[PDB]
Amino acid sequence: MQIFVHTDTGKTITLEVEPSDTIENVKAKIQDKEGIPQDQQRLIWAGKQLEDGRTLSDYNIDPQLKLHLVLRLRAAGGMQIFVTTQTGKTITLEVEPSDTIENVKAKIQDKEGIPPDQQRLIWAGKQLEDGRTLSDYNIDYRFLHLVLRLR
Amino acid sequence: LSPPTNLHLEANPDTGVLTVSWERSTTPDITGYRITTTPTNGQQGNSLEEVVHADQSSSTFDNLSPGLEYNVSVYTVKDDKESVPISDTIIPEVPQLTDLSFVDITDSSIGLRWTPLNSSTIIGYRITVVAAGEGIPIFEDFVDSSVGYYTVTGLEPGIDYDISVITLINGGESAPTTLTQQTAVPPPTDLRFTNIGPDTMRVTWAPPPSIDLTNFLVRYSPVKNEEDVAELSISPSDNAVVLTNLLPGTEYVVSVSSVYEQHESTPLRGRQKT
């Protein structure tokens, strides 16, 4: 199957692999072609990071379709999202799609001192509920500029 | 020996075929035409040639690269001799979707629908959302060449969006096919006035469905002086407010608006005398 790896500058790296091939084998081929060390690479599929030691088949990737991945460097960090407060101050958070809503509220408390029980987080009109992850709402690396509303 | 006239170049993006056509030379007793197609990048060994009979006025070239300029030259041939050529340039394109439409539109999601293109060079499609006012990219994804449907979520109420689908080939892409979407914040309904004393009244309304708002905005004034308008901000989880310090025997006009951050719904208005 063909893989297409989209980078942050708009480049597309092409590979041809088997479904038994591991993620870390794909990073290895990106290293040879771009000089980016394997340990600096994060490969994102549908907004979610693929983990080493798994085959592509273990992610339920359909091998008759073209696989489209995003390359993000560890140096870029996690998702940078924005939270606007009761007053309208914008703050910056760095999260992962596997973070829970309470993890997210904990971070807001770390930066702003708002107890998590006082925090109501809304995403584009939908309240984000405790007990869920960002992923559950499909908040993941595909959202390039995400804004949450506080009250 | 006169060249041909009226050279036309047709690079069909849907089939990938370049059709070269011309008007036959006025010179008597020509023995054919020679057609060359060459990228104008100065790369040697990439030139393509066709030769056709004197009664032929077209030729084709397959597998040209999108985004690369080619020069096409047509020579009138008469035995040993050739004319000065007629020439022109052309840059083939990647086909772009033609029937992209919005479907299955809900308060919290919009569906993108299109017919997948029938070319084997297509490797997939890129879907982008951009807030049109500030030009901020909001969302990006990539899908396989067989996919003809996508669900876009996360559009802020009140914001205008450019939503584009881009056809991808190996080493190329089309111009974006773009739609715009803006979903207004829905108003409250069913405005009612109770507990009406001489200087006070209770205002109640029904909230809009299926949106978590930042707040409600209540505007109220005597009918005979709009310039005396007062305002209160109401919690988005509350559906009532008690107005106090009102003028007696005076009809007030009252409006309630839904608010999502900076954006308001159309106002819910009513009038009520104290």
B232 touching chain A per CB within 8 A: no
Mark whether B148 and B114 lie in a shared domain: yes
Assess contact for B169 and B66: CB atoms under 8 A.
Answer: yes
Mark whether B140 and B202 lie in a shared domain: no
DSSP state of A22: B
Q: Residue A35 is inside which H or E element, if any?
A: none
Mark whether B202 and B178 lie in a shared domain: no
Q: Which two structure tokens, joined as six digits, stand for B170?
A: 């190996």
**Residue B117 and residue B95: Cα distance in Å, rounded?**
8
**Residue B34 and residue B22: Cα distance in Å, rounded?**
12
**Residue B145 and residue B159: Cα distance in Å, rounded?**
30
Q: Report the residue of chain B nearest A148, measured CA to CA.
A: B156
Q: At residue B272, what are phi and psi to the nearest 5 degrees?
A: -160, 130
Mark whether B23 and B67 lie in a shared domain: yes
Q: Give domain status of residue B243, yes or no.
A: yes
Provide the 3-class DSSP secondary structure of residue B38.
strand
**Residue A73 and residue A65: Cα distance in Å, rounded?**
26
Q: Give domain status of residue B95, yes or no.
A: no
A15 touching chain B per CB within 8 A: no
Domain end among B43, B62, B90:
B90
Minimum-distance CB partner of A65 among B107, B146, B155: B146
- Tell me the chain B residues in contact with residue A149 when contact means C-beta distances shorter than 8 Å: 214, 260-261
Q: Which two structure tokens, joined as six digits, stand for B161?
A: 């969006």
Q: Which domain holds residue B34?
A: 5-90
Distance from CA of B136 to the nearest CA of A (A): 8
User: In residues, how long is chain B?
Assistant: 274
Q: Give domain status of residue B96, yes or no.
A: no
How many domains are contained in chain B? 3
Q: Report the residue of chain B nearest A46, measured CA to CA.
A: B141
How deeply is B43 buried, as exposed, middle or buried, from its count of CB atoms within 10 A (0-12, 13-18, 19+)?
Answer: exposed
Mark whether B209 and B256 lie in a shared domain: yes
**Residue B143 and residue B124: Cα distance in Å, rounded?**
5
As beta bridge partners, residue A73 has A41
- Tell me the chain B residues in contact with residue A4 when contact means C-beta distances shorter than 8 Å: 123-124, 142, 168
Assess contact for B164 and B85: CB atoms under 8 A.
Answer: no
**Residue B45 and residue B167: Cα distance in Å, rounded?**
30
Distance from CA of B216 to the nearest CA of A (A): 13
Q: Give domain status of residue B159, yes or no.
A: yes
User: In residues, how long is chain A?
Assistant: 151
Minimum-distance CB partner of B138 among A84, A138, A145: A145
Mark whether B160 and B215 lie in a shared domain: no
Resolution (A): 2.3
Q: Give domain status of residue B212, yes or no.
A: yes
In terms of phi and psi (left: phi > 0; alpha: psi -120 to 50; beta: otherwise), the region of A34 is alpha
Mark whether B199 and B168 lie in a shared domain: no
**Residue B65 and residue B172: Cα distance in Å, rounded?**
9
Q: Give domain status of residue B135, yes or no.
A: yes
Domain end among B90, B120, B151:
B90
Q: At residue B99, what are phi and psi to the nearest 5 degrees?
A: -120, 35
Assign residue B124 the CATH number of its domain.
Answer: 2.60.40.10
Mark whether B152 and B212 lie in a shared domain: no
Q: Give domain status of residue B244, yes or no.
A: yes
Assess contact for B153 and B181: CB atoms under 8 A.
Answer: no
- Tell me the chain A residues in contact with residue B140 when contact means C-beta distances shorter than 8 Å: 142, 144
- DSSP calls for B193-256: EES--SS-EEEEEEPPSS---SEEEEEEEETT-GGG-EEEEE-TT--EEEE-SPPTT-EEEEEE
As beta bridge partners, residue B264 has B259
**Residue A82 and residue A144: Cα distance in Å, rounded?**
11
Assess contact for B186 and B207: CB atoms under 8 A.
Answer: no
Q: CA-based angle B253:B257:B258, to the nearest 5?
A: 165
Q: Give domain status of residue B232, yes or no.
A: yes
How deeply is A68 buried, as exposed, middle or buried, from its count of CB atoms within 10 A (0-12, 13-18, 19+)?
Answer: buried
Q: At residue B216, what are phi and psi to the nearest 5 degrees?
A: -105, 150
Contact at CB, A125 and B215, closer than 8 angstroms? no
Contact at CB, B138 and A144, closer than 8 angstroms? yes
Domain end among B67, B90, B113:
B90
Contact at CB, B154 and A143, closer than 8 angstroms? yes
Mark whether B195 and B213 lie in a shared domain: yes
Structural domains in chain A, sorted by start: 2-76 (3.10.20.90), 79-150 (3.10.20.90)
Provide the 3-class DSSP secondary structure of residue B20.
strand
Q: Residue A104 is inside which H or E element, if any?
A: helix A101-112
B108 touching chain A per CB within 8 A: yes
Assess contact for B154 and B114: CB atoms under 8 A.
Answer: no
Break chain A down into helix, strand, coil percent, rounded to 5: 25, 35, 40
Q: How far is CA B14 from CA A114, B18, B74, B94, B97, in A?
A: 57, 11, 25, 8, 10
Minimum-distance CB partner of A145 among B137, B143, B236: B137
